[PDB]
Amino acid sequence: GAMGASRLYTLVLVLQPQRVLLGMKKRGFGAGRWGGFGGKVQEGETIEDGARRELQEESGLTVDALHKVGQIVFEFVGEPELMDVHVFCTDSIQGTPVESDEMRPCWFQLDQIPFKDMWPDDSYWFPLLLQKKKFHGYFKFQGQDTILDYTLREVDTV
Numbered sequence: 001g002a003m004g005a006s007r008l009y010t011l012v013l014v015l016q017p018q019r020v021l022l023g024m025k026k027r028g029f030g031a032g033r034w035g036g037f038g039g040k041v042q043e044g045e046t047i048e049d050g051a052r053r054e055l056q057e058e059s060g061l062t063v064d065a066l067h068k069v070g071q072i073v074f075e076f077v078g079e080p081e082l083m084d085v086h087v088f089c090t091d092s093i094q095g096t097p098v099e100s101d102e103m104r105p106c107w108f109q110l111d112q113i114p115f116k117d118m119w120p121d122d123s124y125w126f127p128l129l130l131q132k133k134k135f136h137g138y139f140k141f142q143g144q145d146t147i148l149d150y151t152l153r154e155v156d157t158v
């Protein structure tokens, strides 16, 4: 049958040559995991404007440019709506990260990426992001821990 409907999300990784900024989600879905900054795209909002807005809301940072690096679709058993996540990266930041209601920020060295406390899917696509390779992925989850199926491919255009 038809693919489920999807809600549009952004995810921003602040990735510098030696380190990445991650936020620990303090409450709600995925609480206790480190990850990038993002959220739902709003009505009438361009995807990149939503990415910038969510980065500022969750981390306090504003940035010059955002680069498209991949797309990941998430599906959860028992929920018919998919998450269509557009992933971006930025290197040049202005300002200092601030703890928000949603996120507590810490920098991680790129030989200390905290996979054990990140979403399981990150082990598959985060290495591609570090290699500056664009990707499309899909992950079906049972709950927050178990992957039942996934696809992943390198692309030349997000």
Ligand SMILES: Nc1nc2ncccc2[nH]1
Pocket (backbone or CB within 6 Å): 030, 035, 074, 119, 121, 122
């Ligand atoms: N990396 C990553 N973030 C996520 N957020 C919500 C659901 C699944 C997720 N995987």
